């Protein structure tokens, strides 16, 4: 069963859709035949079209609102199968060229929904006296049903397919469905078919990009959700539409909003901010700088040579995670910032300096940077830092801008304790308290490889000892919500699926 | 096409002192880029003298360049009125051009009566074909933080641009009426920018003034200029 969503394009695009789960736009021959169930709309836009077997619309969309039989200005469109129109109302309106069906009514093809039912323009249905409404009301809507309320895998109707995953009360863990059936359209499929990929609601999409991401955990890939930003290269300046670029200039800043590995080289350099002429470039306006925030690698060189003076770190760059040098900027420098007036380097993750050397000079009030024992970042041995001219080290050790004590040896980017490399005790995320809550604290802890993982909020806290051992609610000491066989859980199961979507008692 | 032929409107117009004279130049095309910023100057060149930029955009004024002077335009055609004029202003006022891919400096309305240094090279003459580098030394800004546009002055002519070079990597841009003819290299070490004009024709006499491609204006501060004419 063929499936589809110019008027060459469309004809030739649905001519085979044996079912569309989109909807039906055919607007402005004969192309459309066996149109069998349509999970949407349906834009007649035209006076000869048959769409004879088109059975059901769904209104998952609508052309202004509930409008699912939109017409407008077509005697011989004998839309004698379009029995019921699920979830959606009839704006069968401007029918000038329209014949028999005033005489046929027009709301028995449609549920619940006769409050928006508008129409202007026993008894017969389409043209031709052969054809009928052949009423049947006055889960089957198309007369085992033949079209299903919701779901048909194959013959049967159904509101819901087998789900992808189904509970175990034999591991006492909620568990995949061996009989796993995701919903392709209205029908199941073991398999998510069409190459199409598993999506979050179990309805394979075919695009999945939005508010996530595409991952192939098993044979089929599968939409899930994006971590933070999800991957998004972007050419950068130096390689791509901007290969002439020669600052992430301001009419070229915003084609780097969410642009997650910057393939070129980010360079912001002095005419950037000054805003260039020869170039035609307005100014660099300082917010915007913030777009670049999701960074997480500059596979190439990043040459930061000038920053807003009223901010106080390069926290706009505070989330560059490699910064593979393939590129090197004078064939050395790989992390080059120079002549700046950031207060700390500020850049707190960058964690894997694969090629080049890193030069931060001229940093003449970036003083807590000579610190950093800069041979955990640096990628390969020919690598060696030139951090030079920084604030002098006595002047910043006796003014107090030193590292938080609450953080080991490794030296750290900035003053405040979030910055700094590595922790003196454990660390709880971006930041390193001077200790996890082991038994102390409204988190209340588990620390783990010397980092705090914050308990299972299913947990109660326990005061004696500590909260719980290990990572989800299964290696919590302490359940005081209800807890579900060996494992905690947030509620008892009732409404879960069994053996036929059995819903399990469980227990009290 | 190509060009943007910015034709300002009165010519030599003599002015007395203490009136309110007024050149006009009106655009070949309207010079409004995508930007929608009208990036038109008025750079005012007194006598033997550096070109010195006095409108920045069609209205503001340059930092220094008093408020005498003031402008306004739109579309095709802009002006600016010299509401008091003293001797300081006499000279000629060539309005540039902006948006226009290639910089294009006007014909030349010259008014009469009716620190950063780019330090340039020397006064040369020489033969048909020889080759010319006159150079441009930059002190007192970042070398390679700011683009040194380098004008020419051919002398009875407008100016007009000739290629830039972006003095951090050594890129040129140069210009198309000389796309085939002209070098121009960096020497960021020394804060040198030369500029090698091979195969000089007859008319290439120019005073070749260095000038630095600004942030609001094009061609801030200018240079001193190296006259090279040719003649064989």
């Known amino acids: 069963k063929k499936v589809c969503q110019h008027f060459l394009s469309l004809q030739r695009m649905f001519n085979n859709c044996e079912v569309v789960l989109g909807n039906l736009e055919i607007t402005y021959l004969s192309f459309l035949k066996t149109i069998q169930e349509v999970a949407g709309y349906v834009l007649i836009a035209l006076e000869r079209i048959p769409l004879e077997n088109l059975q059901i619309i769904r209104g998952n969309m609508y052309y202004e609102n509930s409008y699912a039989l939109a017409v407008l200005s077509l005697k011989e469109l004998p839309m004698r199968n379009l029995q019921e129109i699920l979830h959606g109302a009839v704006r069968f309106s401007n029918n000038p060229a329209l014949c028999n069906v005033e005489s046929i009514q027009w709301r028995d093809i449609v549920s619940s929904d006769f409050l928006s039912n508008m129409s202007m323009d026993g008894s017969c249905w389409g043209a031709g006296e052969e054809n009928c409404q052949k009423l049947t009301k006055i889960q089957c809507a198309a007369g085992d049903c033949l079209v299903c309320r919701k779901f048909r895998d194959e013959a049967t109707c159904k509101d819901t397919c087998p789900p992808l995953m189904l509970y175990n009360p034999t591991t006492y863990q909620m568990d995949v469905n061996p009989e796993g059936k995701y919903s392709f359209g209205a029908t199941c499929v073991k398999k998510c078919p069409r190459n199409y990929v598993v999506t979050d609601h179990g309805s394979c999409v075919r695009a999945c990009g939005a508010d996530s991401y595409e991952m192939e955990e098993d044979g089929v890939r599968k939409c899930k959700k994006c971590e933070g930003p999800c991957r998004k290269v972007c050419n950068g300046i130096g390689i791509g539409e901007f290969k002439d670029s020669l600052s992430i200039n301001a009419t070229n800043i915003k084609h780097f909003k969410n642009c997650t590995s910057i393939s070129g080289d980010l360079h912001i350099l002095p005419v950037a901010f000054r805003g260039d002429s020869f170039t035609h470039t307005p100014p660099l306006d300082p917010q915007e700088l913030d777009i670049l925030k999701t960074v997480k690698e500059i596979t190439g060189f990043l040459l930061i040579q000038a920053w807003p003076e009223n901010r106080t770190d390069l926290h706009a760059f505070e989330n560059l995670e490699i910064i593979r040098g393939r590129t090197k900027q004078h064939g050395q420098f790989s992390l080059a910032v120079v002549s700046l007036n950031i207060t700390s380097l500020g850049l707190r993750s960058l964690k894997e300096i694969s090629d080049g050397d890193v030069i931060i000079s001229g940093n003449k009030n970036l003083c807590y940077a000579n610190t950093i024992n800069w041979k955990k970042l640096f990628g390969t041995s020919g690598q060696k830092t030139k951090i030079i001219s920084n604030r002098g080290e006595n002047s910043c050790k006796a003014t107090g801008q030193v590292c938080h004590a609450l953080c080991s040896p490794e030296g750290c980017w900035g003053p405040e304790p979030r910055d700094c490399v590595s922790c003196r005790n454990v660390s709880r995320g971006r930041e390193c308290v001077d200790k996890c809550n082991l038994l102390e604290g409204e988190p209340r802890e588990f620390v783990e490889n010397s980092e705090c993982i914050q308990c299972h909020p299913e947990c109660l806290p326990q005061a004696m000892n500590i909260t719980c051992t290990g990572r989800g609610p299964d290696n919590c000491i302490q359940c005081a919500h209800y807890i579900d066989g060996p494992h905690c859980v947030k509620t008892c199961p009732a409404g879960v699926m069994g053996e036929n979507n059995t819903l399990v008692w469980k227990y009290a | 096409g190509s060009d943007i032929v910015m034709t300002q409107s009165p010519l030599s117009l003599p002015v007395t002192p203490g009136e309110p004279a007024s050149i006009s130049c009106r655009s070949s095309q309207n010079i409004v880029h995508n930007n929608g910023i009208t990036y038109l100057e008025w750079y005012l060149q007194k006598p033997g003298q550096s070109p010195q930029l006095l409108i920045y955009k069609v209205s503001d004024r340059f930092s220094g360049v008093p408020d005498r002077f003031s402008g306004s335009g739109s579309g095709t055609d802009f002006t600016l009125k010299i509401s008091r004029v003293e001797a300081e202003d006499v000279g000629v006022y060539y309005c540039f051009q902006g948006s226009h891919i290639p910089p294009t400096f006007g014909q030349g309305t010259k008014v009469e009566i009716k620190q950063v240094q780019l330090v340039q090279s020397g006064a040369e003459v020489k033969k048909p074909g020889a080759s010319v580098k006159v150079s441009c030394k930059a002190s007192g800004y970042t070398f390679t933080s700011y683009w040194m546009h380098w004008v020419r002055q051919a002398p009875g002519q407008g100016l007009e641009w000739m290629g830039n070079?972006?003095?951090?990597?050594?890129?040129?841009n140069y210009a198309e009426k000389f796309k085939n003819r002209v070098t121009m290299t960096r020497d960021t070490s020394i804060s040198t920018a030369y500029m090698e004009l091979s195969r000089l024709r007859s008319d290439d006499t120019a005073v070749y003034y260095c000038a630095r491609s600004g942030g609001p204006y094009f061609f801030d501060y200018w240079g001193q200029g190296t006259l090279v004419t040719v003649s064989s």
């Open positions: 070079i972006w003095p951090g990597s050594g890129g040129t």
